[PDB]
Amino acid sequence: FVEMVDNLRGKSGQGYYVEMTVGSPPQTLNILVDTGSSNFAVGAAPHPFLHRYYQRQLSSTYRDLRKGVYVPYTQGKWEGELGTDLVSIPHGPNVTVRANIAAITESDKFFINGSNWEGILGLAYAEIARPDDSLEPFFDSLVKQTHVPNLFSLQLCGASVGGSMIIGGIDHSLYTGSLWYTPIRREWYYEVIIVRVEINGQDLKMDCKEYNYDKSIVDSGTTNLRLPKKVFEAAVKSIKAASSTEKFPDGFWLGEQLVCWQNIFPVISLYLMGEVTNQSFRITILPQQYLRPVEDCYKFAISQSSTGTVMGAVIMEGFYVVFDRARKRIGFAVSACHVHDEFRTAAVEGPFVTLDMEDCGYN
Numbered sequence: 001f002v003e004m005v006d007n008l009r010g011k012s013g014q015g016y017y018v019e020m021t022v023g024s025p026p027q028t029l030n031i032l033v034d035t036g037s038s039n040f041a042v043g044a045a046p047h048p049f050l051h052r053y054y055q056r057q058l059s060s061t062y063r064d065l066r067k068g069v070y071v072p073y074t075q076g077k078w079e080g081e082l083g084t085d086l087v088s089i090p091h092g093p094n095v096t097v098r099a100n101i102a103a104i105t106e107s108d109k110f111f112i113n114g115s116n117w118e119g120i121l122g123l124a125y126a127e128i129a130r131p132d133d134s135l136e137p138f139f140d141s142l143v144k145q146t147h148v149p150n151l152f153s154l155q156l157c158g159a160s161v162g163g164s165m166i167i168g169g170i171d172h173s174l175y176t177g178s179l180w181y182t183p184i185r186r187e188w189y190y191e192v193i194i195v196r197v198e199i200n201g202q203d204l205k206m207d208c209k210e211y212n213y214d215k216s217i218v219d220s221g222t223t224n225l226r227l228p229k230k231v232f233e234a235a236v237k238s239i240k241a242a243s244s245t246e247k248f249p250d251g252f253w254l255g256e257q258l259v260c261w262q263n264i265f266p267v268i269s270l271y272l273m274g275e276v277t278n279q280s281f282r283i284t285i286l287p288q289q290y291l292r293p294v295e296d297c298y299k300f301a302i303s304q305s306s307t308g309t310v311m312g313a314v315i316m317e318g319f320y321v322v323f324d325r326a327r328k329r330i331g332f333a334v335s336a337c338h339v340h341d342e343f344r345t346a347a348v349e350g351p352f353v354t355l356d357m358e359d360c361g362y363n
């Protein structure tokens, strides 16, 4: 899959994008890779932020679905006109599919000023597609229409970021050690179950049901590791107790200010439900994952949420992540490109014994 190695680019804090082509003749666009949404949506109008946009008038293969789509969120919106057209990934499988495309015609706080992407590829399942679950997501169309195996994997490496999206397979050069798999609880977001959290090896002794209130997802379209508040404060409570060589204001635990140089911070381990009854594994991240530079200087990349846990780039940049859709599971392995110092490396370890892992899920 050497074709697809290094097929992801971006800028710190602006997401990871892949090159795609839409229409005939092919129109090239940079498209954010997003495992926390399910719409393939592209700029279709000359927004001043945009390098380029989908020009439906130039495409002989374009078909109008004569239906609009309105997507409000926190805190912005995009909206557009639904159609289908021919889609390829130049540095992906050597195929071309007819996919749904939302031509974005109005937008608010969606596109980033200074970014190099013009659209978004929702890689999650139809249940969270807009307007409804009848709009077939891109990856579903891809798997149906070709012989591309029903999985993809992401190596996000982290001004310019790099990475790999391996479509239809796994490149073993992108990781070391073994992959460990956690069940996809339900096919809407990439939902998983966290069963135990350790700050510096120390348990948080919270009812594990709290770690998944009301869900926990894997999301390449989110920068931070995001935790339910009730879990977040207990997590912060421990993190700032483990960090007592220096002092930091309560505004920073959001965060606001920056440490600036020319070990005091604890490692973080999430235990995830395993493939076998009463069996789990753990993924361990460094401070060099939840301490992100802005523009030796760093910010605090863990924050609170009301929609559940979000395993974003903070988590994902330490690991090679396999979205094994065919077997309803997600694999984690230590990434070959993750950033480590001489004292600590990010880790994926198992098996561990954990009882009552079902009680950790919220219904």
Ligand SMILES: Nc1nc2ccccc2cc1CCC(=O)NCC1CCCCC1
Pocket (backbone or CB within 6 Å): 034, 035, 036, 037, 038, 071, 072, 073, 074, 120, 128, 219, 220, 221, 222
């Ligand atoms: N991953 C993401 N991608 C996004 C892309 C555009 C606007 C908002 C986004 C938010 C997230 C965070 C995950 C999330 O809350 N997803 C729920 C809906 C939000 C509306 C779009 C479909 C998915």
